Amino acid sequence: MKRKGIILAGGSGTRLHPATLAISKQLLPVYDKPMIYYPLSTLMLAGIREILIISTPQDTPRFQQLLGDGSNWGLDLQYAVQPSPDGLAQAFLIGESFIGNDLSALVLGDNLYYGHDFHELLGSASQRQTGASVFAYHVLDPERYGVVEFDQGGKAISLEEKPLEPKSNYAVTGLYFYDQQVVDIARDLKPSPRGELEITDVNRAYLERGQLSVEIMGRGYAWLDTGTHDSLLEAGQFIATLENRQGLKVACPEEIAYRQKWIDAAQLEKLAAPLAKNGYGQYLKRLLTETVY
Amino acid sequence: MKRKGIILAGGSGTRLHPATLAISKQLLPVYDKPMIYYPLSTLMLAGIREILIISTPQDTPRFQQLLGDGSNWGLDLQYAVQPSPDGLAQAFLIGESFIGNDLSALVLGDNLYYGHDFHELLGSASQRQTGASVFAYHVLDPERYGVVEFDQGGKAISLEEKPLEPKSNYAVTGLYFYDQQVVDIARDLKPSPRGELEITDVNRAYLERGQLSVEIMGRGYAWLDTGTHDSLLEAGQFIATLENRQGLKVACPEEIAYRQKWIDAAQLEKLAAPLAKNGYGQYLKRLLTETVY
Amino acid sequence: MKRKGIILAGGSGTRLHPATLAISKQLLPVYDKPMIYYPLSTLMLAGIREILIISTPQDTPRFQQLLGDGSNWGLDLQYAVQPSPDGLAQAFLIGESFIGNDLSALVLGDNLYYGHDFHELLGSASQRQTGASVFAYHVLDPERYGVVEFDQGGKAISLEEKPLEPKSNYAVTGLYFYDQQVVDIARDLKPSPRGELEITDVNRAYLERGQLSVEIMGRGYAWLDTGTHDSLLEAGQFIATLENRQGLKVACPEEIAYRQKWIDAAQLEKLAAPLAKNGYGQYLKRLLTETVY
Amino acid sequence: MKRKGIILAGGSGTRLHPATLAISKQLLPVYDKPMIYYPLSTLMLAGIREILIISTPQDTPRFQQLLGDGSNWGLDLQYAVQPSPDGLAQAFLIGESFIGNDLSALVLGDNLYYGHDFHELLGSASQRQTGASVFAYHVLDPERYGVVEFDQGGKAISLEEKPLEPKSNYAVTGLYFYDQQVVDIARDLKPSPRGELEITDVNRAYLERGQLSVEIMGRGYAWLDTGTHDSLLEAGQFIATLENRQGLKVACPEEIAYRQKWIDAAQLEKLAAPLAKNGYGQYLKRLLTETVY
Numbered sequence A, B, C, D: 001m002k003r004k005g006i007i008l009a010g011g012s013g014t015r016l017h018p019a020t021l022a023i024s025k026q027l028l029p030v031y032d033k034p035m036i037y038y039p040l041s042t043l044m045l046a047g048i049r050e051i052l053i054i055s056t057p058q059d060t061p062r063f064q065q066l067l068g069d070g071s072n073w074g075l076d077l078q079y080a081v082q083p084s085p086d087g088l089a090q091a092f093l094i095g096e097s098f099i100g101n102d103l104s105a106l107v108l109g110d111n112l113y114y115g116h117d118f119h120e121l122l123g124s125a126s127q128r129q130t131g132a133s134v135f136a137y138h139v140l141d142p143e144r145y146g147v148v149e150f151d152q153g154g155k156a157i158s159l160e161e162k163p164l165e166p167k168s169n170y171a172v173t174g175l176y177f178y179d180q181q182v183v184d185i186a187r188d189l190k191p192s193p194r195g196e197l198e199i200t201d202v203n204r205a206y207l208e209r210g211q212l213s214v215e216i217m218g219r220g221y222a223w224l225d226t227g228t229h230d231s232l233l234e235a236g237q238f239i240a241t242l243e244n245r246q247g248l249k250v251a252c253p254e255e256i257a258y259r260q261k262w263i264d265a266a267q268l269e270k271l272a273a274p275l276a277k278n279g280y281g282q283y284l285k286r287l288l289t290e291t292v293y
């Protein structure tokens, strides 16, 4: 069965004000491209072409101006609004008609991933047609996240949302793969004491039915989020160091679409034209004649 | 005589696309606050309260949403549009009625300044009620700028806009103080070979009449570059290092207004309220009870 | 057959003076640990325990003070001097008696690697008991390196040392695996026009005999070198971002030895003792009770 | 009267191990030059030519190899050892015969200063031929330092070394100017509860006699932190940003000596020769023909 994608690029409330007073966090650049390019590229790398972008009423037209309907990149993008930030699990109610009877994947609009064989890590989660798949990653500050606990055999046995005393240093990352049960689970969720529909409650529902796969995302992968001004800056520096070293870009959607064969050489050449006088368009042009393994 | 301020926050064309596709460069954050806070703070530090913000037609309402009429900060802000990026000198034609018969100051919306006694450096330019004052700063790449040449006595003798063979390494920074002659000079400007109304032509008009003061902005000042992705990132890191070392902010307009006595303690306390859950509001609150020299 | 390691941590001449006037480049820290810890950790990750450190006459005792005989980490370290910087291929002549009749691996003392399944990438090169194995990596500036050219089938067909017009963007990284033929090949090398015994000439000798394996090190790996002051700084920032995100260290030799089972819990506890009041010793202590996948 | 300088470049214990296992912190580079160049340049900027460098027994010959007797730079450098890190005030006992009956200045070997008119700020402290002068700087973490308390009139009224409950956010920086009384005061000091001869006790002695001038080092100056790996890295980035923006170096001793007229053009040209193949020597060469204001 095919899998649809959702990017949640909602309000980060007032947390990063005044930097985010004028625009949405997920429109801020990480080095050389808007933040949302990164999770969008993540969905694309998982082979997902039909994608719903959920944002605030105010910023939706700005996402639309940036991304269009996706057709330029071999995608089909649709848009939905989240009037109020009522929790990550709300994506499934807002996205209910978009999803229909299909499999799905949710990615947070401010999550960046980097590493070798990421494509294959995503592929193996995408091919699991039943149940749910999340990724666990070792962090310094697991108390900020959904935390997964494992028994001595390596099996996930509990999930806790922002525990004061984390059972491990393994956080659940902001990338989630779901079967056709997720909308019904989300519909039956009640708000938590913070007034939010919690994704962790969704994941625990799968866990209790023995249908949650927790794959380790190893330390050789970088999972960056952009939760503070400091971490945003570090994410920019990280991407810049890689791109300036390699002469290759991270999360260039045009490149990914070209490599997935969703667009061809002539379409890529046309996409390069408007940006030909800057490094980004020069990069797209170089992609036409260079072999990159 | 009073001096009015103008902030030119216009289009950077396609140079930083796709990062700047969604929103204007001068609304992007530098570390923890929108870029435009920095030149705005520069004008305020010069004692300027009546300020015209010029931007593109698309982004004007976003500057308006962010900054309002200024009254919350003891300022009087007005707004105007630049339909096409036809040169920095265009600010004086767009801003003609705003300026009237008063003295003026122009700052570029993407210029950041830092250093000791910057207040005094601006004060001494502001008090010159005749002629014009600009600042020259030693840079590695003077070709990118208006370049000033000095004779052996230290007197400015020529200005060249983006010369292929710069006469010195001294660039004219994006901060300009003018008397009542600037509008009339701007009205008589003809477009350059690049189709732009050049500020450098304005400055050369004053130079030929012996009325251009070119002050050296010494190497102990930081005039930070935001022209490239790399330089944007370096500026964010520079500001973060200073703020995290000192526990004091650079270019916090609320603080500057409070210290200029344009707003009082009770007004500052009210401004802190909406942001009380984050570091920026906590900073404003701390300013009410701490003596800072 | 067993494989011995060599780390070349020689003079970088005057290239980074005055920063390197007082000490060797490979003793400078990258974030929180001396540079040489990184390539040392790379050899360890490849399963190599018997390692020759080649440095200048002046700095050998400083490497010795830092690293000792290796016994604290389950290694056996020996030391050799390189009086004059006569080329990377000289490591095999200086290291001839150390190597004996064994397989070998050479790593440059200023090369840093990071990425997922690096262990497995190294393992597959280490298990090739005949011929030579190098890694090719896409860089922005291949003209600074040994460059490998591939035919349409992906087969390596030429190697060029620092070509003005590189045949590809694939540089040979500073990690090299060799069979028992390398010493004899090195002995027959004549100095190049720059007066150096070139590693690229060694690699081309294997290529001509059909015994060079060129494995791609993919873009999901970070290969950093520290060839300039700028790149050194970027390498520090890169490592710090990863370690501060994960609460896990890159190239902690004590950790690697513990995970390879070369030292046990009680030995690791003793190594933690001297450093117990700083973050590094606290990290080693935490490793005793935490499960990390 | 003439004023002699002392640079205290002693042990940082184990705090930054293993990075500092091999070599002293003050020999590590900050961006492009050894750390000690920065405080050395600070003394030079204050017009001080006769300078005692105090370090550990192990690292003294390395400071000597780097700096020599100073004669190449128009300085007269001498050397002395601190066997154990028994407090900053120990500098005056070790340095007693060097100081003699002259005025003095102490700078810590890991303190970096930057800002406009720093020369003048140092000059005005240097010209005070009686009493002592220190500088107070607003910091986020005053507990780490000597902390100065001021009454409502702005007068310094107490000094506390590393108070658990700081009376202000004003730290005393690691630059101190003293009259002929300091040696005798240092001789009468008793160790504190931490077993250290405290500079803060020296400064309090002057305070009680009404002879401590506490000048504010304003927020437009950078007093950069090198106490942690993170802060070391931030300092390197800060210096790189300034130097790469300006094409001018911070704390180039050859430049400062040339500008003070302590060495002439021909001597500077000779100093450039050995480094002519790298940016540092190219910079010195450029200084011979460029006017820099």
Ligand SMILES: Cc1cccc(S(=O)(=O)N(C)c2c(N)n(Cc3ccccc3)c(=O)[nH]c2=O)c1
Residues within 6 Å of the ligand: A038, A039, A041, A042, A045, A112, A113, A114, A115, A116, A117, A118, A119, A249, A250, A251, A252, A255, A256, A259, A260, C219, C220
């Ligand atoms: C953030 C992000 C989004 C999408 C992919 C990746 S990645 O797998 O770590 N990575 C560096 C990457 C790639 N590996 N690739 C190559 C690639 C593209 C399509 C399919 C398989 C490989 C790419 O075109 N762009 C990339 O950013 C990172």
Ligand SMILES: Cc1cccc(S(=O)(=O)N(C)c2c(N)n(Cc3ccccc3)c(=O)[nH]c2=O)c1
Residues within 6 Å of the ligand: B038, B039, B041, B042, B045, B112, B113, B114, B115, B116, B117, B118, B119, B249, B250, B251, B252, B255, B256, B259, B260, D219, D220
């Ligand atoms: C970019 C910029 C904008 C406004 C001020 C400055 S500044 O003078 O270099 N600077 C660090 C600074 C200050 N010096 N001050 C203190 C100050 C406030 C009002 C008048 C004179 C000084 C402040 O309140 N905010 C500041 O950002 C830099």
Ligand SMILES: Cc1cccc(S(=O)(=O)N(C)c2c(N)n(Cc3ccccc3)c(=O)[nH]c2=O)c1
Residues within 6 Å of the ligand: A219, A220, C038, C039, C041, C042, C045, C112, C113, C114, C115, C116, C117, C118, C119, C249, C250, C251, C252, C255, C256, C259, C260
């Ligand atoms: C620079 C470097 C040196 C050695 C390993 C590595 S690495 O494979 O990219 N990496 C992050 C890494 C690890 N993967 N590991 C875990 C590990 C240790 C030993 C065997 C297999 C795995 C580790 O203990 N330290 C590491 O630095 C990087």
Ligand SMILES: Cc1cccc(S(=O)(=O)N(C)c2c(N)n(Cc3ccccc3)c(=O)[nH]c2=O)c1
Residues within 6 Å of the ligand: B219, B220, D038, D039, D041, D042, D045, D112, D113, D114, D115, D116, D117, D118, D119, D249, D250, D251, D252, D255, D256, D259, D260
């Ligand atoms: C750390 C430090 C050490 C010495 C000077 C300085 S500085 O005054 O802030 N500074 C940027 C600086 C300078 N201002 N100058 C110019 C200068 C040289 C001699 C006397 C007065 C000024 C210089 O030649 N080198 C410098 O590093 C900072």
Ligand SMILES: [Cl-]
Residues within 6 Å of the ligand: A115, A116, A117, C218, C219, C220, C221
């Ligand atoms: Cl890869």
Ligand SMILES: [Cl-]
Residues within 6 Å of the ligand: B217, B218, B219, B220, B221, D115, D116, D117
């Ligand atoms: Cl200056």
Ligand SMILES: [Cl-]
Residues within 6 Å of the ligand: A218, A219, A220, A221, C115, C116, C117
């Ligand atoms: Cl891994």
Ligand SMILES: [Cl-]
Residues within 6 Å of the ligand: B115, B116, B117, D217, D218, D219, D220, D221
């Ligand atoms: Cl100041």
